[PDB]
Amino acid sequence: MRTLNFNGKISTLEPLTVTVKNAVSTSGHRLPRNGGFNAAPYFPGTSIRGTLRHAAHKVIVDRVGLNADGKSPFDLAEHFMLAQGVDINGEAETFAPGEINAGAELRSKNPLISLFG
RNA sequence: UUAUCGGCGAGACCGGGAUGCACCUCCCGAAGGGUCU
């Protein structure tokens, strides 16, 4: 139980672009600016978070591997729980909203869900 | 931090034509010399 802060630099080997609905207009494709066109753009943390969540999901599937049938053990519900984080079958541990520290069992049993809620 | 969760993405050759060239003397002036078996 330690807060690991990773601080560091991303050097861009090939240009780093992202399409965002607000950033892109009929004037043309622009990066998110946090202001006007003169402001300094930023690569959203959402895109990096999604990329790292997809990478973590790939790690989890590879660590689990496939069944004897050659099919992934995850169904659509589990797959969306691990990738997008939303319950599709309505079967999820609805913890009390006033319990900041809830889900310790799920957090221990599912480290992907723990990292990316 | 008024909660909890969400990669925006996928495709495209921008290329196709061109002589930069045509004229000019850079020359005009000079002793490097004298000394020692």
Nucleotide lying nearest to A87, CA to C1' measure: B5
CA A35, chain centre distance (Å): 25
- Quote the CA–CA distance of A31 and A17 in Å, as a whole number: 7
How was this structure determined? It was done by: cryo-EM
Asked if residue A49 keeps its beta carbon closer than 7 A to nucleic acid strand B, the reply is yes
Q: Provide the CA A11 to C1' B8 distance, Å, integer.
A: 22
Asked if residue A110 keeps its beta carbon closer than 7 A to nucleic acid strand B, the reply is no
Burial label for A81, CB within 10 Å (0-12, 13-18, 19+), is buried
Positions of strand B less than 7 angstroms from a protein CB: 3-10
Helices marked H in chain A? 45-64, 76-83, 104-109, 111-115
Which residue bears the tokens 């797959």?
A79
Resolution (A): 2.9
Q: One-letter amino acid identity for A76?
A: L
- Quote the CA–CA distance of A54 and A39 in Å, as a whole number: 30
The breaks in chain A (C to N more than 2.5 Å) occur after none
